C-alpha cells in the first residue's frame, strides 16, 4: 500500500489546516492516512501502484477530506454541516 | 475479540476530543469500546482479525462516532443535531456486503 | 435477570451526567433501571444472559436513555425536545 | 389495587420535580396516584398484582407523568406543550 | 349527586392554584364544582356513585380543568390558549 | 317563568370573576351578567331547566367566561385579534 | 320606533365607554341610536313594540356595537379592526 | 334633494373627527356632502324625502364615509387601508 | 368643457393638500385639471353641461386623485403605492 | 410635431421635480421630451395637432414620466421599483 | 455611423452620473458609445442616418443603459440588480 | 489573433475597477485577456479581424466580464452572486 | 505533460489571493497542480501540447479553482457555499 505521508509531506498537511505545533503528529498523521484511504477507496483505481501515480486533483480531495477531519470532530453536529461540492468534483474527474 | 485501545490509543481518544483530564479514562473507554463495538457491526467485515488490519477510514468513523457520545450525553436533546455524512461515508467503503 | 450496576457501575451513570453529589443515588439507580429494562426489551435479545454478554454499542444506548430520564423530568415540556438518533443506531445494530 | 408510594416513596416523588418543602405532601401524594393510575390503566397488565411486579421502564413512566402534574397545572396554557416521546415509549414496551 | 368537595377538598383545591387567601372560597367551589360537573358528563361512568369511587385519574383532570377556570376568566382572550393534552388523557382512560 | 341570572350567580361572585372591588358599577355589571345568562340559556336551549337550582354548575362557568368577555372586551370590532377559549363552549356542550 | 335611551339610559352608554365628560352627549346619542337601529333592523322581530320587550342579549350587542361608533370613527383605517365575535352571536340567538 | 347638514349639524360633524378650528368650515361640509351623496345612492331609497327621513344607522354610516374623507386625502397612500366593516354594515341594513 | 375651478375654487384644493402657499398655484391649477380630466372621462356623464351639476361624491373623488398628484410625484417609487378604494367608490355610483 | 415646452413649460417640470437651480436646463429638457415622446406614442392619438389639444390628465402623466427619468438615472438598480398606477390609467382614458 | 456624441453631448452624459470631472472622460464615452450601440441595434431602426434623427424616449434610454454601466461595473454582483421597467418601455416604443 | 489591449487599454481596465497602483498589471492583464477570450469565443464572429472591428457593445460587456474577474477571486463564495444581465444583453446583440 | 506554473507563475497564483506570506508555497504549488488538473481533465483538449496553448478563459477559470481551494478548505463547511458561475463559463467556452 501507498503511505499517504509519501503523497503529501507531513508539514503540508499541517499548513493545510494552520497547525504550527509538532504535538499531533500522530492525530493529525491517523486523519490523514483515513482521508487518503477513503480517496482511494473512492477513486478505485487500481493502476496507481506508487506515490507518484496520484494525480493532483485527487491529492487537493485528500486535503479537504482531511481538513474536514481536523475542523469537525463529531459524528453529529449541533451546527448544520454543508458538503463542499470541490471534493466531490476532484475525484470525480478520476474515479475508474 | 479486537481491543479498541489496541487499534487506537486512549491518548489519541483524548485528543480527538481535546480533553487532558485523567480523572475519566473509564468512561471514556467505554464510550471508546461503544464506538468500536458499532462500528464493527456495521461494516460487518469478518477478515478482519486482528487490530492492525482495521482500515484507516474506519478508524477516522470510529472516533467522530466517540467523539459524539463524549459530546452529546442524552437520547434527546434541546438543540437539533445534525448527521456529519463523514462517518458514515467513511464506514461505507468498507461495508462488507 | 440482570442487575443493571453489573453491567455499567452507578459511578459511570454519575459521570455520564457530570452529577458530583452522593444524595441522589435512588433516583440516580431508578433511572438507570429503566433505561436498562427499556433497551433490553428493545433488543430483546434472550442470548444476553449475564451483564459481561451486553455489547458495548449497547452500554452506550443505556447511558443515552438515562442521561435523558435525569435531564428531562417531564412527560411534556414547554421546548421541542429533538431525538439524539445515537441511541436507536447503537441498539438497531443488536436488535433479534 | 396497589399504592403508588409502595412503588416510588413519596421521597423519590419529589426529589423528581426537585421539591424540598413538607408542606405539599397530600398534593404531592395525588398527582403520584393521579400519575399511577393512569400509566396502570395504560399499559393494561393484570399480571401486575404487587408493588414489586412494576416493570422499571413503567416506574420511569410515573416520575415524567407525575412530574408533568406538578409543573404544568392548568387545562389550557399560554404557551403550547410538546410531548416527550420518553414517557410513551417507556409504557409501550410493557403495553399488554 | 357526589360533592366535589368529598372527592378532593377545598383546601387541596386551593394549593393546585397556589391561592393563599381564604377570601375567594365560595369563587373557587363554583370552579371546582364547575371542573367535577364537566369531568362526570364527559366520562360518563354511571358506576361511579359515591366520593370514593373517583379514580385518581380522573382527579387530577378536574384539578387541571379547575385551575384553567382559576386562571383564565374571559371566553375570548387576546392570547392564544393551547389545549394541555393531560387533561383529556386522564379522563379518556376511564371513559364509558 | 324566566330563570333570572342573579338567582343563580350571585352579583358579588361575578365582581370576583373580573377582580372588580368598586361598588359604583352594578348596573352595568347587572347586564353584561343578564346578557351572558340569556346567551348561554339560549344556545344551550334546554325548556329542561325549570328553577335556578336546574342549571348544572358546567353551565354556570359558561355564563361566568361570557359574562368577563364582555366586561373585559367592550367593543364590536377590536386593533387585537380575540381568540375564543374552548373552555366555554365546552362547558356547555355537555348540556 | 323604539327610543334607545328608553332602553339603555345614556349614562349607562357613558359608563360602557368610560367616558366621564358630558361635553358629547349629542353625538354619543347618535352612536347609541345607530347602534340600536342596526341591531334592531339585524334581528328583524316585530314582537319587540316596546323598550321594556328588549332582551339583555341584544341590550349586550347594542353596547358593543355602540363602542365600536366611539372609538372607530373612519370608514377605513390604517389598522386592521377584527370582529369581536361576540356582537353577532348575541344577536344571532334572538334573530327572527 | 336632502341638505346633509338639516340632517347632521356641521358642530356634529367635527365632534366626530375631533377637529376644533373654525377655518375649516368649507372643505368639512364637502366632506360631509360627499359623503351623505354616497351613502344616499348607495341606499338608494327614494322614500326619504326630507331629512327626518333618514334612519339613525346611515347616519351613522355618513359619519364615519366622512370622517375617512377627512383624515385620508389622497386617490393612492403608502400606507394600506384596511376596511372598517361598520360602515357598509350599517348601511346595508337599509339598502333599496 | 368645465373649468375644475369653478367646481372646487383653488383655495379648496390648497386646504385638502394643507398646502399653505401661493408660488404653485400654477402647478396645483395643472393637478386640479388633470383630476378633474381623468373623473369626468371615468364617469362619462354627458348631463353634466356646468359645474353646478357635478354631484358632491364626484367632487370627493376628484379631491382624493387631485391630492394624489400633488404627494406622488413619479411614474414609479421605490415604496409601494396602495389603492385607496374611496376614489373609485366616489365615481362608481355616477357613472354612466 | 408637438415641442413639449408648448405643452407644459419647463418651469413647471422643476416644480414637479422641486429642482430650484437653472444649471440643469438641458438635461431636464431632454427628460421631458423623452417623457411626452413616450406618453404620445402610448395614447397614439394623431388628431392631437397642437399643443393646446393635449388633454389635462394626459399633461399628468407626462409629470409623472418625466420625474421617474429625473430621480431613476440607471436602467438597473438595487431597490426595487414599483409602478405608480396613476400615471397609466390617465393616459389609458385618452388611449386611441 | 452615427456619433453618440453627436446625439448626446459628453457634458450631458457626465450630468446624468452627476459625474464632475475631467480625468474619465475616455472611460464615460466607452460607456456612452455601448449604450448608444446596445439602443441602436434593439431599435433596429434604419430610418436614423443622423444624429437628428434620433427620437427623445430612445435618447432616454441610451442614457439610462450608460448610467447602469457607470454605476453597476461587473458582471456579477453579491446584490441582486432589478430591471428599471422604464429603460425597456422608451425603447420599446420605437422598435422597428 | 487580436490583442485585448488594441481593444480597450491597461489604463482603461484599471480605470473599469478603480485601481490606481502599479503593481498588479500582470494580474489585470490576465484578467483582460480571459475577459476578452471569453467575450469573443461566446459571439463567435469571424468578420472581427483587427482591434478596430470590436464594436462598442462588446467592448462593454468585456469591461463587465473583466470587473468580475478582479472582485470576485474564488470558484465558490459564502454569498451567493447574482448575474449582471447587462454582460449577456450587450453580447447577445453581437452574437453569430 | 505542463506544469501549471509554465502556465501561470507562483508569483500570479500568490496575487490571486491576496498572499503576500513567503511561507505557504509548497501549499500553494499543490492546490494550483490540482487546479490545473482539474481544469485540464474538464477541457479534455488534448490539442495543447506547451503552457503558450492555453486559452487566457482556461486560464481564468485555473485562477477561480485555485482560489477557491486556498480560501474554503474542508469537505464540509458550516457556511453554505454557492457555485460562481465564471468558473464554468470559462471552461466550458474551449471544451
Ligand atoms: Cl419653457
Ligand atoms: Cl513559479
Known amino acids: 500500500a501507498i503511505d499517504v505521508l509519501d503523497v503529501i509531506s507531513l508539514s503540508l498537511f ?7 505545533e ?4 500522530e492525530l493529525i498523521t491517523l486523519y490523514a ?9 473512492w477513486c478505485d483505481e ?3 501502484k506508487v ?6 486533483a ?3 480531495a485528500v486535503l479537504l477530506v482531511f ?3 481536523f475542523e ?21 474527474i478520476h474515479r475508474n
Open 22 to 25: 509538532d504535538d499531533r503528529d
Open 33 to 41: 492516512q483515513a482521508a487518503f484511504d477513503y480517496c482511494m477507496r
Open 67 to 69: 481538513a474536514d477531519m
Open 72 to 92: 469537525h470532530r463529531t459524528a453529529q453536529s449541533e451546527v448544520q454541516l454543508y458538503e463542499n461540492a470541490a471534493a466531490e468534483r476532484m475525484m470525480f
Open 46 to 48: 487500481p493502476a496507481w
Open 58 to 60: 485527487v491529492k487537493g
Open 14 to 20: 499541517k499548513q493545510q489546516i494552520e497547525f504550527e
Open 51 to 56: 506515490a507518484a501515480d496520484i494525480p493532483a
